[PDB]
Amino acid sequence: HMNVGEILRHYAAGKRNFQHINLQEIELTNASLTGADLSYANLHHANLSRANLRSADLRNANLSHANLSGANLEEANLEAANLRGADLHEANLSGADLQEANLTQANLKDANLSDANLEQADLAGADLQGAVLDGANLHGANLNNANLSEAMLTRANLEQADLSGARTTGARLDDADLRGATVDPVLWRTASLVGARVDVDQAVAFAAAHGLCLA
């Protein structure tokens, strides 16, 4: 296990290779480790609140129940990372790679996921209230029972995503691509959808969700 003094001294010396390092429970609030290779690192329950991890490599890292509130993760590689129950509220994940990441039960309230890659990510039960996912790729993402209340999914790719059980009151889906997605009828009644791309079957479902009869 590497401690705070050690990792900050190494980083100060210009070292960036921290792959597979054990940093469980470490206290790194307001720390900057931009560009660090933390691939496969164990950061379980780490406190990384307001840390600057811009452009860090965190692929397949264990970030389960980590505190990443307000952290900068712009253009970070979080592919296949374990972020179950992590606190990412108000984090900047703009342009981050989160494909196939485990974000189950994560706190993403007011998170910035603009232009992020969330292809096949597992967001089941995640809280995305007030989050911004403009231009994000959610192709095939699992949004089962997620909270999307007041979330901005404008211009987002939701093709083949599963939004079963998602809360969508106040959700903003203008210009989103919904083709092939699985959604509850209530989505058609709650989301703003101007410019949203749909299949014919979905357009019919939109009409049915407003009480029209096709018999």
List contacts with a copy of itself (CB under 8 A). Answer: 193-200, 202-204, 206-208, 210-215
Q: Are 79 and 61 contacting, i.e. CB atoms less than 8 angstroms apart?
A: no
Judged by CB, which is closer to a copy of itself: 9, or 210? 210
Site residues (CB under 5 A) for Cl ion, limited to 157-176: 172
**CA 189/CA 210 separation, integer angstroms:** 7
3-state secondary structure of 137: strand
173 and 153 Cβ atoms separated by less than 8 Å? yes
Choose the one of a copy of itself, Cl ion, none that binds residue 197, judging by a C-beta under 5 to 8 angstroms depending on kind: a copy of itself
Binder of residue 50, out of Cl ion, a copy of itself, none (CB less than 5 to 8 A by kind): none
Report the distance separating Cα 208 and Cα 185, nearest Å.
8
Q: In this complex, which beta carbon is closest to a copy of itself, that of residue 18 or of residue 188?
A: 188
Rounded CA gap, 15 and 200, in Å? 55
Q: Which of 76, 72, 109 is nearest to 95 (CA)?
A: 76
Q: Smaller CB distance to a copy of itself: residue 13 or 200?
A: 200
Task: Write down the least CB distance from residue 19 to a copy of itself, Å.
Answer: 45
Q: Which is nearer to a copy of itself, 35 or 170 (CB)?
A: 170
Residues near Cl ion (CB under 5 A): 12, 172
